[PDB]
């Protein structure tokens, strides 16, 4: 499931009781879809300042 395209998670994918659970690093919030990770600030970790 997390093997199948990271279970559709933007970031952290964990298999808990047969199902995918997505989570996000600090400075990100999980979207309504329970998969995408949304920055909370202008300089979230792991983003090039392009």
């Amino acid at each position: 499931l997390c093997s199948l395209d990271n279970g559709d998670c933007d970031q952290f994918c964990h298999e808990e009781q047969n199902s995918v659970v997505c989570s996000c690093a600090r400075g990100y919030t999980l979207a309504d879809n329970g998969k995408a990770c949304i920055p909370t600030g202008p300089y979230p970790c792991g983003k090039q300042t392009l």
Binding site: C2, N6, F12, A25, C45
Partner: protein
């Protein structure tokens, strides 16, 4: 860095440079947060006093985004072995917090299980620093980056004349003349996943630089994530 490319504006913003008494960069670091820098424990024996410079891309110009930070506390792993460079990890708390901006941003700390199963099974990571551009050369005045293939533990252990511990992994090319080099130690090894960069390594050591059948050796950050998390609350 031997070979690879210059870090262009905003490309390597988690790059930190450890600067000695005489303002010479000797080691790299990775910005984890406004207060915490990740580096190699062995870098702590390279200078009696040192500071951390962030947002530096040219060590012969003032691009204007550079800032120097005093280290409040050094957190070295108690099991660091100078003889083997085992447990080659340190965390620096700065006296003053970093202000994120152009060329100044933190790398994400991954969760261990996901990092090992997902990140370190990607083809390549990216290493960066102001280290030497040739094995017996001088250090770079430009911040450089290099894409380095992950190397399976077995091939790596075969390759090394020195001990490869469980706190180490291997990255770079067999024959191709691109590698990290002296001065890059302590700097970032990051892995891109869906356009987000996670810290996966610390530049630790190598048998010279870019030698045939020899790889760069990186502290396995994934094995120290709880140690890093614990250090960052004191």
């Amino acid at each position: 860095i031997v070979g690879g490319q210059e870090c262009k504006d905003g490309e390597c913003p988690w790059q930190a440079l450890l600067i000695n008494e005489e303002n010479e960069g000797f080691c790299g670091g990775t910005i984890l947060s406004e207060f915490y820098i990740l580096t190699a424990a062995h870098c702590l024996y390279q200078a009696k006093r040192f500071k951390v410079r962030v947002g530096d891309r040219n060590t012969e110009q003032e691009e204007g985004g550079e800032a120097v930070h005093e280290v409040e506390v050094v957190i070295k792993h108690n099991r660091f072995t100078k003889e083997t460079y085992d447990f080659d990890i340190a965390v620096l708390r700065l006296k003053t917090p970093i202000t994120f901006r152009m060329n100044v941003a933190p790398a994400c700390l991954p969760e261990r299980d996901w990092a090992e199963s997902t990140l370190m099974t990607q083809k390549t990571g990216i290493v960066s620093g102001f280290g030497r551009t040739h094995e017996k050369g001088r250090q770079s005045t430009r911040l450089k980056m290099l894409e380095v293939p992950y190397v399976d533990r077995n091939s790596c252990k075969l390759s090394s004349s020195f001990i490869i511990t469980q706190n180490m992994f291997c990255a770079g090319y067999d024959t191709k003349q691109e590698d990290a080099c002296q001065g890059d130690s302590g700097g970032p090894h990051v892995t891109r996943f869906k356009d987000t960069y996670f810290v996966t390594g610390i530049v630790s050591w190598g048998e010279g630089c870019a030698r045939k059948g020899k790889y760069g050796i990186y502290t396995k950050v994934t094995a120290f994530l709880k140690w890093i998390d614990r250090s960052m609350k004191t």
